[PDB]
Amino acid sequence: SAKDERAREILRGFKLNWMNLRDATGKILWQGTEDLSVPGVEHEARVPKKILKCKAVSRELNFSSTEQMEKFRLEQKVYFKGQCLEEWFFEFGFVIPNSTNTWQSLIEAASQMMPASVLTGNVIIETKFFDDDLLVSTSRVRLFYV
Template sequence: MEAKRSHVRVVGAPDDDNDDDVAQAKLSKLTVDDTRYAHPKDDAKHSDDGDGDSDGAVRVAERKLDLEVEREWKQARLDTGPGRIAVANNPRAKKIARGLVINHMNMRCADTGKLLWQSSEWTCMMMMMISAARIPAAILKCSAVSREINFTSKEEITQFRLEQRVFLGDCCIEEWLFTFGFVIPGSTNSWQQTIEGAGADAMLDPDVVSGKLTIETAFYDGQQPIAKTVYRIYYV
């Protein structure tokens, strides 16, 4: 399953040969939009325009990424635990991690625009220990959720992207991949993704999974790891 600039692997997809009960535990089924923009004070512009040759190159690159995603997903299914917290040993990656700040994040109902959750409590501690997020259970009833991340980077990031894995207990049940692209040094940017719900029949029961669900977020510059964070999700 694929959406422009985003790739999603969901347990229970047609090419998944695992038919056990966990295949019914889904948080979302598809990332349908992935939008990024720099704040007006920055001159950052992101354009996907190009000629036929560049379009062909993009298709080849996307196909290559699809194959990499499939291999990574198979490996992810073998991993156990609630996710891992880490900062890369690479000096350049460490410098990026020190200068990368999430200013705030919010989630809204994509249909109505109603604000459901927001937080500005993002500190360097998120790269040192498991953090907690308390999210309204009503968010699971939305047919789609719009998430906006506002971040600042002191350093240039050539190909900024995220890999997020959702763990239920020790089992990785879902993986989301998002690509932002080039980040201007010293810039503040907003990044918005819209995620469709899995549907009432496939959605996790918030009363059952609250406190048992963790989300591991890995930050990358291209293929170079920057850092990983883990948040434990509580539905309230």
């Protein structure tokens, strides 16, 4: 498949270099330099339990891409014991080939949050990276609230 080949070339040229998450306040709650978008392994992350109390979280994601993309975007779902509680869609748009870019996003809370003690180790955030219609990769991060 031609679309399969193109998806693989974009994955091959892509890297998430670093990311922060902030109370939308301004305070950095989490930051890391591990590429959490790599597919096929379950990533793990520890975040402060107080993040669950934010009405919104601001994310800064810095990424490199050898390939040009027409409409880079993400679909992300929070799963609790296998069940999707919440979904978000974000669009970055055009990506210049061989560029490194910082993408800021406002992630808004939906519903009432279970306690951190119940959620911890039982939440997966699944992130699907698209160029327009073309699915480039699916990755998963298991969350611990600490």
